[PDB]
Amino acid sequence: SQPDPKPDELHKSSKFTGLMENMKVLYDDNHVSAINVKSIDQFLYFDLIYSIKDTKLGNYDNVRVEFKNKDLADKYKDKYVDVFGANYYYQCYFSKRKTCMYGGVTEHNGNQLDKYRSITVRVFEDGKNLLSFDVQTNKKKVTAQELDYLTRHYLVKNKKLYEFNNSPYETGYIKFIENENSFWYDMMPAPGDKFDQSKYLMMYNDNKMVDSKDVKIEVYLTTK
Amino acid sequence: EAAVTQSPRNKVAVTGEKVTLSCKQTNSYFNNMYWYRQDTGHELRLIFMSHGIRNVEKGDIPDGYKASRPSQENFSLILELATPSQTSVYFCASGGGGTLYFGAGTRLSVLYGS
Numbered sequence: 644s645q646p647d648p649k650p651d652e653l654h655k656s657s658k659f660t661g662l663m664e665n666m667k668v669l670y671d672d673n674h675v676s677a678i679n680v681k682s683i684d685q686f687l688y689f690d691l692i693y694s695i696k697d698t699k700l701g702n703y704d705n706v707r708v709e710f711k712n713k714d715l716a717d718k719y720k721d722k723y724v725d726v727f728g729a730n731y732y733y734q735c736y737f738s739k740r741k742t743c744m745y746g747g748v749t750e751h752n753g754n755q756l757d758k759y760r761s762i763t764v765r766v767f768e769d770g771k772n773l774l775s776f777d778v779q780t781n782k783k784k785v786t787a788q789e790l791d792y793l794t795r796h797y798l799v800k801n802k803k804l805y806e807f808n809n810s811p812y813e814t815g816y817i818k819f820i821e822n823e824n825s826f827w828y829d830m831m832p833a834p835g836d837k838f839d840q841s842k843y844l845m846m847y848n849d850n851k852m853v854d855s856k857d858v859k860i861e862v863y864l865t866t867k
Numbered sequence: 868e869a870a871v872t873q874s875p876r877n878k879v880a881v882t883g884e885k886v887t888l889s890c891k892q893t894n895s896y897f898n899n900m901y902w903y904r905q906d907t908g909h910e911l912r913l914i915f916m917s918h919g920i921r922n923v924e925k926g927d928i929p930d931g932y933k934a935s936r937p938s939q940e941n942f943s944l945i946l947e948l949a950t951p952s953q954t955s956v957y958f959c960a961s962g963g964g965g966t967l968y969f970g971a972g973t974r975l976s977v978l979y980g981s
């Protein structure tokens with residue numbers, strides 16, 4: 644289990660002077676999504692390269708999925724898997740049209756549910772749970788990344804979580820509770836002049852999974 | 868040969884109107900694109916840049932503008948609530964490890980309301 648964030652631990656959006664669009668866009672309508680596919684190349688020893696066409700916009704024919712370590716790369720190489728990720732293009736390199744992501748991989752066989760499951764998200768604004776809603780998945784074991792993405796996607800459309808210039812919210816974190824054990828991610832960008840998509844998204848490289856049946860999601864936002 | 872097509876070439880709008888200028892690469896797949904505006908027969912001033920897809924970078928003169936790079940070929944400039952003061956000629960450019968390719972320019976006139 645992970646300790647809840649100490650006061651000044653959380654990133655303050657007022658201390659970020661770049662364009663929030665560069666965070667917003669990671670959680671827009673688009674994302675990497677593939678069903679039942681096998682790695683077809685590898686660049687470095689901790690990544691795998693999948694052949695996935697961006698049918699929608701033509702932005703990529705292949706996808707580099709990057710992991711925290713060799714073991715995760717080894718584990719899923721040769722496996723038939725489902726991919727779901729928030730992807731980046733700017734400082735994305737690997738040896739056509741390309742994109743890059745971290746983690747976001749689950750075994751295909753035996754992970755498919757017959758019906759979609761609902762997971763409740765409770766959104767606290769300055770400590771008041773004034774909005775709740777459900778995200779949905781059809782995977783038994785789902786990555787935190789996918790759930791995070793689905794959650795922020797909604798919140799962008801419906802609460803302007805991220806805008807072009809900045810955000811109405813000063814701080815924000817997303818908490819994943821699974822029984823007793825729990826963890827969280829900082830939803831705001833590191834402080835400074837520019838936002839580093841690659842670095843931010845790297846947090847997903849642990850490929851952390853949760854159980855769709857018994858996970859709950861809490862999101863804590865504070866205003867300025 | 869690599870080129871850049873802005874759209875439209877000439878536009879008139881009312882104060883308060885949402886205006887969108889388009890810029891599309893043809894025969895290229897370049898990472899860098901640029902939106903400038905030119906003041907009155909003088910220097911180009913950079914509003915926004917983009918180092919690639921899903922990247923926008925502030926320029927010298929970004930206030931009151933937004934921009935958007937949803938794919939390599941396309942870099943759009945967004946005026947959310949147009950101001951007369953944004954009356955100008957605007958120039959798009961793409962760029963590629965050596966050269967720059969410029970659009971023909973968009974003359975935008977933003978008039979006052981009733």
Ligand SMILES: [Cl-]
Binds near residue numbers: 662665837923924
């Ligand atoms: Cl930035």
Ligand SMILES: [Cl-]
Binds near residue numbers: 927
């Ligand atoms: Cl200057």
Ligand SMILES: [Cl-]
Binds near residue numbers: 926927
């Ligand atoms: Cl400068």
Ligand SMILES: [Zn+2]
Binds near residue numbers: 910
């Ligand atoms: Zn000057």
Ligand SMILES: [Zn+2]
Binds near residue numbers: 918924
């Ligand atoms: Zn730059």
